[PDB]
């Protein structure tokens, strides 16, 4: 094999060598970096690439693939199930190759806090700051950027259902209205986990159920379709 | 110059034994089995013992220096494998069962475990107090010469430390953080 | 291995929704997920899909020496296996509680129905009788098992084919070439399993629960009804308040279902028989083999085949040739003097 | 004349595990299951179990399941990350020739699907020789007993580098030579087949 | 067979088979009971809600825990066979036991507590299960552990187009038409229920009813065998 | 369980000839055997020792008795531990003593030759009589390993092997005619000695065995011959001290061994139809 | 240590083993034939302190119904907590077994003995073989220790003759012991230890084969009839690379062949 960036800006196989006349970059997911430089394909995916230019403190060469297990990244948005609370940190699940960990403090409280507000089998909305190849990942719930609070332990009642990443992505694409498109219907509360997790909760079971089911199919539809399909729901 | 755990030499009237010790009613029987050794005391009498081929015995000292290679990394807690409590020790019994915390990962700064010593590398540190309440030992990397010493790249290179908090490989270019 | 976790809301609400008499997988309280059945390349092979739960059925043919006592009606055996790949928690060995109860539980209604003759197989009673073993492999595991589990077998049992050519006096001979015809079985009765799940004091009752359902249900009951609208077995589990009265509808309702379920076996059982006698197409499953995506089938050519075969000498000669002389040395090394 | 039999495979079948793969070599097929990368309460360890449609798993299996296991630690870059454990299970679906071969690609895909990081891909090819010195690609339950030499090779996708082999037969070196080499060309096809099929799965990804 | 108002054993198909029970036997346990369904004998023993013993691991908190062992005398049967090898039945059996009290027993006031009840068949003669059921039941009644209701299991066989209760052994040998249930007259909920016979979908009401009522009797019967042991032990 | 503060008295107390329960040193307790209580087979007995209960059954069988010793009859002992027996050993706990006592009772009666290989040997080289002696334990009254010595014999004098006549085939069995029965006082037994200092005892509560490392295995017949006898312990002893305990074997055993070996008749006399 | 990975190879880069060997080293090869009296055919071979004794007992049975008059050869490869504390305390070990069959597959890939000769009474009698070999000290090429422990253990087997008189079997110890044990083919097995980049050593050691990366064994008849090839995933390879193993294996074969052939007139008759 022999390739470089554009040589294949498409789909590749696990076990390939390719590179560009470079110096430094951040190895993505299904690619390996060793050779001046070079790269290897490990998993099986198409080629993806986001450019940093220079100012943009973010630039990598990516290889994605619609595979089962979810892979946490930077401060990613995921939904959780709490596997267990052992000491100051508890592991919640995210469907990674293992769990992650949350502090006895990520809810803006000093001890004697979030006690009954943290429980096995529970749900959580969290962005984990730490997920790096050789280390295990851990997540938070505060808004450290300003220590505000954008992520709480999920709702009073509700629903969570898996979702094809392909969809989660497309469902979360800023240039996709579904999100605002959904901004419609009232009164509703839903959460969107990278890890493919939608926690919903509408008036009754029903509108709620529909909505989810509607979601389960969301993907293949007139870029418009959902629209009424939604304003259909919206209306009742 | 040999003994079997069933022969006797002296008795409570001359010496006591640390090695190969077996005593009943005052005489000297040899517990151990393998070789015979005698002792001279600063008291005008000798101590008796059998010979422990394993002259190397547990000696990891409380606040002592050690050679170790990291294990698992928690951006909050750090784990390690220690082999040499200096060098005389080759012991692998305590194998790698030791822990250190950021606060003691240095004396100043505030750089996370993640940016100090990774999973695969060998590190050097002195020992802190030990509370065998969980079978763990505490150690520090708060020294101008202390810290970690091993460097491996993404390609498979070795790294030199470009600074107090960095190591790097010449092949590819990795500006990485490791407590030098 | 990996413990498939389980939220709170998930469970709670899953129920919430049962309280709603609404099925999550959006169906009705007494329906089955669609169930499909694929037949094997060879006879005696089958695969079931209770829609997400998958079973494997294989039957065996033998001329064993029947047991002591009634050395007049040969024996049969069946086994049900739970796979690793079955569930995550299915590391071979531990789940007994299922493999125990279930394997036996299942196996119960088999000898219960005696739906299988034991003397028709028996060739030389007291001496050589037939042994038919049947094996069940739980491939995937989603919700109601024992049912696909049963189907699996029954469905399987009808497809197998026992051989037989000519055995006279005290001699036994059978030839596959003559076996090209005789090879059927004694399937007198055909019983199936119907489980009923209960919810909160069985004040709610489900049928053919899916995995998720499987968990939420407090207590479950099973039933066995052969085509002749009669039972063979029932089993109560998960401890519940099962009012003799209510115990009664289910019983009923079970019959109701067994009805249609049979239809299929026969239905497809026929569809299969047809294909062998026509165009022809045994295999495992071409259906999944043609349906767009995640599957592909094509046949490719083999002079690229023989063109390189001569290269063997090139590598065989270039290397070894110089490699064989070290022998003259090995002749004398450890053998000559070792005479001690 | 030297062609491997009918080729087919199904990916992502069983919803239960992280890795599903069903491979079909003519009237023969096998399905492999992977409950992929798992952190088990170092590196990544792979243990694989294969059981048969008929009878229970014999000891022959135990050994056979080992080769598969090894052939993989080999390509499974997955071994990479520590603490992790990885499991594969193979099920005897359709036997009829090239037994071991099928399992390979099945288990391989098993992983492909289980998206465990691989370094290379491995395919298996089998061959039979008659008392007349005749070898065939993708043998047969027929071919297999009618032959005297039967072999299956585990090969490198990147390097063809025979990453493994196991056999019973009456052949010598003069034998072990072409066939392996031939096995190359054969594997090369399988290996080609993969690509195409993998193009299928991702047809709209 | 059985007829004219006289079953094969020699008894009304509605009349059970006298049973005597020695409960609170060996006092070296806590829960002890002995009984024989006519000519079916077995011994069941339970040990109080002792804190989780062996294998300190597994330990259901919210409610207690339950364990029950079943084994039979190798000769208790007709001939003799291997008990630790042909486990399949027993164990299967055991679970059945488990479930039953596991339902009614009140593990709701014994968090982590671990109550183990083991039963042995001394002389086997039909209705084996139903035997240990009570046999066990009594065992606990002795170990006085609180329980929702007092429960007993009966058998009900349908033969000669008729309903017989407590198919001893000989009839168990029939067409195999036999069903059993464990029952709590308390409200009459059907705790456990296991029928294994090829009966048509409507001898149920009948057979079902058979065992159903049958228990209710067995109940009043032991209700006394029990009401008696309380007053005398009261001395 | 096993405490030292208490283990103190236990040992001195037994040396002191002040056991625990108003017992000197070599004291037993009311031990009885009820013969036949299993309405399902030959030999039967329920010996209740202190706080332990044992039961043994026996049945007959024909045909091959083996290969090297076809022209005879040998015995088969299968033993069971009751989950009710050991509040400890549950499902995989019987194996222990369950296999051991199965062997200890298997060797004793094996070499003892107190076995009518003769009164058990149908058509030699073809048919032979085989009896299965099975065990069950319902409790533990200490020295429980001995109760098996009695229930193992006590159930044997009642082994009314059926009067069976075979005629080549054809079988004749007289339920009313029970005479082809074999029972002899050649039957061996078990005598144990565990030490509680230098004052060694036989039949001592567990609380008591608790204060010792080893005990002695001795076997005697009606009078005083020896069957399998062994030293059983995790500790050690002194041979000179062996012959003393050793004789305690022919000496103390025959005592209640003789007084019991008799009671088999006490039940047979005040009840030929009374029982 | 978990560290010395390269250390071991340091010797290797400059080709040499911390054993003092290199590309091919049939170290200490020793056999004690019939060393086991209480057995009709035995052979003990200890190489670099590893002991696999092939203890063979013979028994009489009954050739299958389908395979009418077919002999009976049965092997068993066991390893207790002996040869290495690093072993289990119960039923067969993962590898423990693979070998079991290995020999077997070999036994069957070899044709050493034609079942024909095992039948005591063609169609109602057969000769059973139990060749149980056990590694007393494990460390290196546990695989070869058998091809030899076994090959030799067999030549050590000798039994009387077969006879049936008026519905009885007549064979006496001091009978006629002819053809005791002879196989037209005496192939043997060899084990190479390899390292990623194919730099491979032979007769790997307990540790050597350990940090190994690939195992490969080859069995070849006298005439050089490649019995079977074994390769539990060997990093990949080269026919030529294999070619070396091909021929260079032959060599260690002649040696052992002689190593045994040498026990013919000496340790056989002494």
Swiss-Prot record, chain A:
Residue stretches spanning the membrane: none
Q: Where in the cell is it found?
A: Cytoplasm; Nucleus, Nucleolus; Nucleus
User: Hey, which family's this protein in?
Assistant: Belongs to the RRP40 family.
Give the function comment from the record: Non-catalytic component of the RNA exosome complex which has 3'->5' exoribonuclease activity and participates in a multitude of cellular RNA processing and degradation events. In the nucleus, the RNA exosome complex is involved in proper maturation of stable RNA species such as rRNA, snRNA and snoRNA, in the elimination of RNA processing by-products and non-coding 'pervasive' transcripts, such as antisense RNA species and promoter-upstream transcripts (PROMPTs), and of mRNAs with processing defects, thereby limiting or excluding their export to the cytoplasm.
Its protein name is Exosome complex component RRP40
Q: Give the source's domain of life in one word.
A: Eukaryota
Q: Which GO terms describe its cellular component?
A: cytoplasm; cytoplasmic exosome (RNase complex); cytosol; euchromatin; exosome (RNase complex); nuclear exosome (RNase complex); nucleolar exosome (RNase complex); nucleolus
Q: Which gene encodes it?
A: EXOSC3
A GO molecular-function annotation: 3'-5'-RNA exonuclease activity
Cross-link Glycyl lysine isopeptide (Lys-Gly) (interchain with G-Cter in SUMO2): give the residues: 112
**What are its GO biological-process terms?**
CUT catabolic process; DNA deamination; exonucleolytic trimming to generate mature 3'-end of 5.8S rRNA from tricistronic rRNA transcript (SSU-rRNA, 5.8S rRNA, LSU-rRNA); isotype switching; mRNA catabolic process; nuclear polyadenylation-dependent rRNA catabolic process; nuclear-transcribed mRNA catabolic process; poly(A)-dependent snoRNA 3'-end processing
From Swiss-Prot, chain D:
Q: Does the keyword Disulfide bond apply?
A: no
Name by which UniProt lists this protein: Exosome complex component RRP46
Relate the outcome reported for changing residue 176 to H. Answer: In CABAC; strongly decreased interaction with EXOSC3, EXOSC9 and EXOSC10, when assayed in a heterologous system
Q: Which GO terms describe its biological process?
A: defense response to virus; DNA deamination; mRNA catabolic process; nuclear mRNA surveillance; poly(A)-dependent snoRNA 3'-end processing; RNA catabolic process; RNA processing; rRNA catabolic process
Write out the annotated subcellular location: Nucleus, Nucleolus; Cytoplasm; Nucleus
The signal peptide here is: none
Reported effect, residue 118 to T:
In CABAC; uncertain significance; no detectable effect on interaction with EXOSC3, EXOSC9 and EXOSC10, when assayed in a heterologous system
The organism encoding this protein is Homo sapiens
Q: Which GO terms describe its cellular component?
A: cytoplasm; cytoplasmic exosome (RNase complex); cytosol; euchromatin; exosome (RNase complex); nuclear exosome (RNase complex); nucleolar exosome (RNase complex); nucleolus
Swiss-Prot record, chain E:
Q: Which Pfam families match?
A: RNase_PH, RNase_PH_C
What the entry lists under InterPro entries is as follows: ExoRNase_PH_dom1 (IPR001247), ExoRNase_PH_dom2 (IPR015847), ExoRNase_PH_dom2_sf (IPR036345), PNPase/RNase_PH_dom_sf (IPR027408), Ribosomal_Su5_D2-typ_SF (IPR020568), RNase_PH (IPR050080)
**Which GO cellular component terms, listed alphabetically, does the Swiss-Prot or TrEMBL entry include?**
cytoplasm; cytoplasmic exosome (RNase complex); cytosol; euchromatin; exosome (RNase complex); intracellular membrane-bounded organelle; nuclear exosome (RNase complex); nucleolar exosome (RNase complex)
For this chain, one GO molecular function annotation is: mRNA 3'-UTR AU-rich region binding
A GO BP term, please?
positive regulation of cell growth
Q: Which organism is it from?
A: Homo sapiens (Human)
- Is this entry keyworded RNA-binding? yes
Give the keywords, sorted.
Answer: Acetylation, Cytoplasm, Exosome, Nucleus, RNA-binding, rRNA processing
Q: Major location, coarse class?
A: cytoplasm
The reply on keyword rRNA processing is yes
What the protein does comes down to: Non-catalytic component of the RNA exosome complex which has 3'->5' exoribonuclease activity and participates in a multitude of cellular RNA processing and degradation events. In the nucleus, the RNA exosome complex is involved in proper maturation of stable RNA species such as rRNA, snRNA and snoRNA, in the elimination of RNA processing by-products and non-coding 'pervasive' transcripts, such as antisense RNA species and promoter-upstream transcripts (PROMPTs), and of mRNAs with processing defects, thereby limiting or excluding their export to the cytoplasm.
Could you tell me what this protein is called? Exosome complex component RRP41
Compartments where found: Cytoplasm; Nucleus, Nucleolus; Nucleus; Nucleus, Nucleoplasm
Swiss-Prot record, chain G:
Which keywords annotate this record?
Acetylation, Cytoplasm, Disease variant, Exosome, Neurodegeneration, Nucleus, RNA-binding, rRNA processing
Gene that specifies this protein: EXOSC8
Q: Which disease is it linked to?
A: Pontocerebellar hypoplasia 1C: A severe autosomal recessive neurodegenerative disease characterized by cerebellar and corpus callosum hypoplasia, abnormal myelination of the central nervous system, and spinal motor neuron disease. Affected individuals manifest failure to thrive, severe muscle weakness, spasticity and psychomotor retardation. Vision and hearing are impaired.
Regarding protein family, the annotation reads: Belongs to the RNase PH family.
Key word Acetylation present in the record?
yes
Write down the InterPro entries for this protein, in alphabetical order: ExoRNase_PH_dom1 (IPR001247), ExoRNase_PH_dom2 (IPR015847), ExoRNase_PH_dom2_sf (IPR036345), Exosome_comp_Rrp42_subfam (IPR050590), PNPase/RNase_PH_dom_sf (IPR027408), Ribosomal_Su5_D2-typ_SF (IPR020568), Rrp43 (IPR033196)
Please list the disulfide bridges.
Answer: none
- Quote the CDD domains the UniProt record gives: RNase_PH_RRP43 (cd11369)
**Which compartment or compartments is the protein found in?**
Cytoplasm; Nucleus; Nucleus, Nucleolus
User: What cellular component terms from Gene Ontology apply here?
Assistant: chromosome; cytoplasm; cytoplasmic exosome (RNase complex); cytosol; exosome (RNase complex); fibrillar center; intracellular membrane-bounded organelle; nuclear exosome (RNase complex)
The protein's name in its UniProt record: Exosome complex component RRP43
The molecular function terms in GO held by this entry are: identical protein binding; mRNA 3'-UTR AU-rich region binding
Please name the Gene3D superfamilies in this protein's record: GHMP Kinase, N-terminal domain
Q: What is its main location?
A: cytoplasm
Pfam families membership: RNase_PH, RNase_PH_C
Q: Which domain of life is it from?
A: Eukaryota
């Amino acid at each position: 094999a022999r390739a470089a960036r554009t040589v294949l800006g498409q789909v590749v196989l696990p076990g390939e060598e390719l590179l560009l006349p470079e110096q430094e970059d951040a190895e993505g997911p299904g690619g390996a970096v060793e050779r001046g430089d070079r790269l290897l394909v490990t998993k099986c995916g198409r080629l993806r690439h986001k450019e940093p230019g220079s100012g943009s403190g973010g630039g990598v060469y990516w290889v994605d693939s619609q595979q089962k297990r979810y892979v946490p990244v930077k401060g990613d948005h995921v939904i959780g199930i709490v596997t267990a609370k052992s000491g100051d940190i508890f592991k919640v699940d995210v469907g990674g190759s293992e769990p992650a960990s949350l502090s006895y403090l990520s809810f803006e409280g000093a001890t004697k806090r979030n006690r009954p507000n943290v429980q096995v089998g529970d749900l959580i909305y969290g962005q984990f700051v730490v997920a790096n190849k050789d280390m295990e990942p851990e997540m938070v719930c505060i808004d450290s950027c300003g220590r505000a609070n954008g992520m709480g332990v999920i709702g009073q009642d509700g629903l969570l259902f898996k979702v094809t990443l392909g969809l989660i992505r497309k469902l979360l694409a800023p240039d996709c209205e579904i999100i605002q498109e959904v901004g419609k219907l009232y009164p509703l509360e839903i959460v969107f986990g990278m890890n493919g997790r939608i926690w919903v909760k509408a008036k009754t079971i029903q509108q709620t159920l529909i909505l989810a089911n509607i979601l389960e199919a969301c993907e293949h539809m007139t870029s418009d379709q959902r629209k009424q399909i939604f304003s259909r729901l919206a209306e009742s | 110059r040999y003994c079997i755990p069933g022969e006797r030499l002296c008795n409570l009237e001359e010496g006591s034994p640390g090695s190969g010790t077996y005593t009943r009613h005052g005489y000297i029987f040899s517990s151990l089995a393998g070789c015979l050794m005698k002792s001279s005391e600063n008291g005008a009498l000798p101590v008796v013992s059998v010979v422990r081929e394993t002259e190397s015995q547990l000696l990891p000292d409380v606040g002592a220096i050690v050679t170790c290679k990291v294990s698992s990394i928690n951006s909050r807690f750090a784990k390690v494998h220690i082999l040499y409590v200096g060098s005389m020790p080759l012991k692998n019994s305590f194998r790698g069962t030791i822990r250190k915390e950021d606060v003691r990962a240095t004396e100043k700064d505030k750089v996370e475990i993640y940016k100090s010593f990774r999973p695969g590398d060998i590190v050097l540190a002195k020992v802190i107090s030990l509370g065998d309440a969980q079978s763990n030992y505490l150690l520090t990397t708060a020294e101008n010469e202390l810290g970690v010493v091993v460097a491996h790249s993404e390609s498979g290179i070795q790294m030199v430390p470009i600074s107090w908090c960095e190591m790097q490989c010449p092949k590819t270019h990795t500006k990485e953080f490791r407590k030098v | 291995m990996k413990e498939t976790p389980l939220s709170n809301c998930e469970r709670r609400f899953l129920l919430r929704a049962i309280e709603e008499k609404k099925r999550l997988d959006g169906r009705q309280t007494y329906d089955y997920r669609n169930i499909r059945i694929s037949f094997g390349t060879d006879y005696g092979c089958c695969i079931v899909e209770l829609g997400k739960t998958r079973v494997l059925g294989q039957v065996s043919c033998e001329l064993v020496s029947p047991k002591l006592n009634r050395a007049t009606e040969g024996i049969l055996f069946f086994n049900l296996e739970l796979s690793q790949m079955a569930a995550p928690a299915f590391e071979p060995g531990r789940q007994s509680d299922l493999l125990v109860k279930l394997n036996r539980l299942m196996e119960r209604c088999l000898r219960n129905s005696k739906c299988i003759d034991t003397e028709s197989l028996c060739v030389v009673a007291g001496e050589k009788v037939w042994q038919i073993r049947v094996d069940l492999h739980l491939l995937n595991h989603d919700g109601n098992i024992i049912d696909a589990a049963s189907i699996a077998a029954i469905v399987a049992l009808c497809h197998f084919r026992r051989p037989d050519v000519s055995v006279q006096g005290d001699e036994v001979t059978l030839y596959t070439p003559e076996e090209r015809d005789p090879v059927p079985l004694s399937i007198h009765h055909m019983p199936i399993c119907v489980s009923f799940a209960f919810f909160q004091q069985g004040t709610y009752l489900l049928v053919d629960p899916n995995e998720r359902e499987e968990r939420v249900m407090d207590g479950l009951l099973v039933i066995a009804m052969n085509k002749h609208r009669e039972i063979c077995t029932i089993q109560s589990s998960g401890g519940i308040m099962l009012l003799k009265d209510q115990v009664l509808r289910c019983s009923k309702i079970a019959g109701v279902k067994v009805a249609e379920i049979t239809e299929l076996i026969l239905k497809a059982l026929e569809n299969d028989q047809k294909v062998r006698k026509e165009g022809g197409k045994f295999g495992f499953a071409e259906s999944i083999a043609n349906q767009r995506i995640t599957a592909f089938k094509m046949e490719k050519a083999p002079x690229x085949x023989x063109x390189x075969x001569x290269x063997x000498x090139x590598x065989x000669x270039x290397x070894x040739x110089x490699x064989x002389x070290x022998x003259x040395x090995x002749x004398x090394x450890x053998x000559x003097x070792x005479x001690x | 004349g030297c062609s491997l039999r009918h080729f087919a495979c199904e990916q992502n079948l069983l919803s239960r595990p992280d890795g599903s793969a069903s491979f079909l070599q003519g009237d023969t097929s096998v399905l492999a299951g992977v409950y992929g990368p798992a952190e088990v309460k170092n590196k990544a360890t792979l243990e694989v179990i294969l059981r048969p449609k008929i009878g229970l798993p014999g000891v022959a299996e135990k050994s056979r399941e080992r080769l598969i296991r090894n052939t993989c630690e080999a390509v499974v870059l997955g071994t990479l990350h520590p603490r992790t454990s990885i499991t594969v299970v193979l099920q005897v679906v359709s036997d009829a020739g090239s037994l071991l071969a099928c399992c390979l690609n099945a288990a391989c895909m098993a992983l492909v699907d289980a998206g465990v990081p691989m370094r290379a891909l491995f395919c298996g090819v089998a061959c039979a020789l008659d008392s007349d010195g005749t070898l065939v690609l993708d043998p047969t339950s027929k071919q297999e007993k009618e032959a005297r030499a039967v072999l299956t090779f585990a090969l490198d996708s990147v390097e063809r580098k025979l990453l493994m082999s196991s056999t019973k037969g009456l052949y010598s070196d003069t034998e072990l030579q072409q066939c392996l080499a031939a096995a190359q060309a054969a594997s090369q096809h399988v290996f080609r087949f993969y690509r195409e099929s993998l193009q299928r799965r991702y047809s709209k990804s | 067979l059985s007829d004219q108002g006289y079953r094969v054993d020699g008894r009304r198909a509605g009349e059970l088979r006298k049973i005597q029970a020695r409960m609170g036997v060996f006092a070296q346990a806590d829960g002890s009971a002995y009984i024989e369904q006519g000519n079916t004998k077995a011994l069941a023993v339970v040990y109080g809600p002792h804190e989780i013993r062996g294998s300190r691991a597994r330990a259901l908190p919210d409610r207690a825990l339950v364990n029950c062992q079943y084994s039979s005398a190798t000769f208790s049967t007709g001939e003799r066979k291997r008990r630790p090898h042909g486990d399949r039945k027993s164990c299967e059996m055991g679970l059945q036991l488990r479930q039953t009290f596991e339902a009614a027993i009140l593990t709701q006031l014994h968090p982590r507590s671990q109550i183990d009840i083991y039963v042995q068949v001394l002389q086997a003669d039909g209705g084996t299960y139903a035997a240990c059921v009570n046999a066990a039941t009594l065992a606990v009644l002795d170990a006085g552990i609180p329980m929702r209701d007092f429960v007993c299991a009966c058998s009900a066989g349908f033969v000669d187009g008729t309903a017989l209760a407590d198919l001893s052994h000989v009839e168990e040998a029939a067409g195999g038409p036999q069903l059993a249930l464990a029952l709590l007259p308390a409200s009459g909920q059907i705790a456990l229920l296991e029928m294994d016979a090829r009966l048509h979908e409507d001898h149920l009401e009948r057979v079902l009813e058979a065992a159903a009522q049958a228990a209710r009797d067995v109940h009043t019967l032991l209700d006394r065998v029990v009401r008696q042991h309380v007053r005398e032990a009261s001395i | 369980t096993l405490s030292e503060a208490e283990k103190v008295y236990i040992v001195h107390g037994v040396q002191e000839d002040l056991r625990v329960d108003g017992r000197g040193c070599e004291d037993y307790r009311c031990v009885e055997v009820e013969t036949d209580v299993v309405s399902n087979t030959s030999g039967s007995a329920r010996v209740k020792l202190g706080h332990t209960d044992i039961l043994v059954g026996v049945k007959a069988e024909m045909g091959t008795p083996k290969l090297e010793k076809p022209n005879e009859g040998y015995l088969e002992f299968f033993v069971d531990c009751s989950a009710s027996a050991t509040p400890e050993f549950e499902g995989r706990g019987g194996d222990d003593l369950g296999t051991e006592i199965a062997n200890t009772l298997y060797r004793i009666f094996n070499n003892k030759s107190s076995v009518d290989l003769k009164t058990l040997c149908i058509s030699p080289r073809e048919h032979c009589w085989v009896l299965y002696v099975d065990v069950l334990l319902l409790e533990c009254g200490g020295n429980l390993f001995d109760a098996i010595s009695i229930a193992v014999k006590a159930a044997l004098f009642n082994t009314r092997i059926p009067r069976v006549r075979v005629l080549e085939d054809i079988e004749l069995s007289d339920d009313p005619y029970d005479c082809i029965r074999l029972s002899v006082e050649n039957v061996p037994c078990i005598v144990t000695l565990c030490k509680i200092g230098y004052r060694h005892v036989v039949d001592a509560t567990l609380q008591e065995e608790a204060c010792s490392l080893a005990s002695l295995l001795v076997s005697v017949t009606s009078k005083g011959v020896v069957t399998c006898m062994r030293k059983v312990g995790k500790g050690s002893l002194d041979p000179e001290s062996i012959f003393e305990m050793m004789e305690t074997g022919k000496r103390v055993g025959k005592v209640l061994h003789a007084s019991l070996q008799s009671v088999v008749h006490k039940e047979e006399s005040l009840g030929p139809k009374r029982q | 240590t978990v560290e010395p990975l390269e250390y071991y190879r340091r010797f290797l880069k400059e080709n040499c083993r911390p054993d003092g060997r290199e590309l091919g080293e049939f170290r200490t090869t020793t056999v004690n034939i019939g060393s086991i009296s209480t057995a009709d055919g035995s052979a003990l071979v200890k190489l670099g302190n590893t002991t696999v004794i092939c203890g063979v007992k013979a028994e009489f049975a009954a050739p299958s119904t389908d395979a009418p008059d077919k002999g009976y050869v049965v092997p068993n490869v066991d390893l207790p907590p002996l040869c290495s504390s690093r072993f289990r305390s119960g039923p067969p070990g993962e590898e423990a077994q693979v070998a079991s069959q290995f020999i077997a597959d070999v036994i069957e890939n070899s044709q050493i003995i034609q079942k024909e000769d095992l039948c005591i009474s063609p169609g109602k009698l057969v000769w059973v073989l139990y060749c149980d070999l056990i590694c007393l000290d494990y460390d290196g090429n546990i695989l070869d220790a058998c091809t030899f422990a076994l090959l030799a253990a067999l030549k050590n087997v000798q039994l009387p003759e077969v006879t049936i008189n008026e519905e009885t079997a007549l064979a006496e110890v001091n009978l006629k012991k002819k053809s005791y044990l002879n196989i037209r083919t005496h192939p043997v097995a060899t084990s190479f230890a390899v390292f990623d980049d194919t730099l491979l050593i032979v007769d790997p050691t307990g540790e050597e084969e350990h940090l190994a990366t690939g195992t490969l064994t080859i069995v070849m008849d006298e005439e050089g009839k490649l019995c079977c090839l074994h390769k539990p995933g060997g990093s990949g390879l080269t026919g030529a690379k294999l070619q070396d193993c091909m021929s260079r294996a032959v060599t260690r074969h002649k040696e052992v062949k002689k190593l045994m052939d040498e026990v013919i007139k000496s340790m056989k008759p002494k």
